[PDB]
Amino acid sequence: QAVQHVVIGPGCVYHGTLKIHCAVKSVSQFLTEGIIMKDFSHPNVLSLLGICLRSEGSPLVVLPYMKHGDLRNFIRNETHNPTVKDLIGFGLQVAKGMKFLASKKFVHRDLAARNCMLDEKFTVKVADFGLARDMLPVKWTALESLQTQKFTTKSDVWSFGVLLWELMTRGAPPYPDVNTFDITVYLLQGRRLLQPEYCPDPLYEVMLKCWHPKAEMRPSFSELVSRISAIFSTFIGEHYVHVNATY
Ligand SMILES: O=C(NCCN1CCOCC1)Nc1nc2ccc(Sc3nnc4ccc(-c5ccc(F)cc5)nn34)cc2s1
Numbered sequence: 001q002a003v004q005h006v007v008i009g010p011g012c013v014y015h016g017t018l019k020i021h022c023a024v025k026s027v028s029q030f031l032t033e034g035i036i037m038k039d040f041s042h043p044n045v046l047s048l049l050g051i052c053l054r055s056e057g058s059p060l061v062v063l064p065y066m067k068h069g070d071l072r073n074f075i076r077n078e079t080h081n082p083t084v085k086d087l088i089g090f091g092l093q094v095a096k097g098m099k100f101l102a103s104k105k106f107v108h109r110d111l112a113a114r115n116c117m118l119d120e121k122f123t124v125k126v127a128d129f130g131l132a133r134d135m136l137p138v139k140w141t142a143l144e145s146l147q148t149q150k151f152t153t154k155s156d157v158w159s160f161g162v163l164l165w166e167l168m169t170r171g172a173p174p175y176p177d178v179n180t181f182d183i184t185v186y187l188l189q190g191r192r193l194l195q196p197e198y199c200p201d202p203l204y205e206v207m208l209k210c211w212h213p214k215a216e217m218r219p220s221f222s223e224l225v226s227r228i229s230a231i232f233s234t235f236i237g238e239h240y241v242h243v244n245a246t247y
Contacts (some may be wrong), residue, residue, distance in 0.1 A: 003034055006051055009052070021224075024052075024062050026060055031051075031138055042160065044126060045101060047125075048063060066117035067118070073114075074172045075087065083239040088231060091163070100128060112163055114128075115187050116163075139180065142154070154218050157219065160209075164207050168196035
């Protein structure tokens, strides 16, 4: 009876109706996960509409349809014309979504532009969590977490810095000439992702702070929302961001 308000009625995802447009994904823990995921509610977090075990379901996770799909594909699309302002605004929304999740003691572990969705208002939702979770991810993972398989909000912060880099390169693969088994050795040489051409200096400083070698010295998502909202406020949407030819 704790899962009833999560329940609705009369793998991979497919379309769906109720009208409201949705995405439908396809036993005690499933009903538990419904209730927990149902408790997360923030404009920059993908909400669960409800679940279907009936009858028998499969089961079925029903999520709001995101008109514009994943953030990575959206910024990569050559027919899109984002400004510095737009891209930073997307980063600011992810940071707000993560500040909420961190407040709920939730550790994402797979924060990446591919795992964020965009609705018809271009509101960014952090997704790929709860029932909707699916597939290492080496290139987004904090150094300590690669080394110890332990994940924290401070390791999400490192991931968020890589996501900002994605944003500012319009979806370039991070560390392209680097193979995933070798990323630990590469970083321990004293290396970070390079400053994208259309990345403002203060935002590259923010990325570098997100990648601080001491997890405790990284900014919280709350300090990131504050810092990024200030940077965002200085732009007016006159700087068009192009794609690098090498990526
Ligand atoms: O795809 C669209 N819109 C069409 C976008 N088009 C594409 C063609 O270009 C024109 C614009 N809406 C959708 N809403 C939803 C709502 C929920 C879910 S499941 C889920 N839960 N967490 C995550 C996290 C990531 C992914 C994911 C990753 C890579 C991808 F590639 C696609 C989706 N899924 N995911 C799927 C969809 S898909």
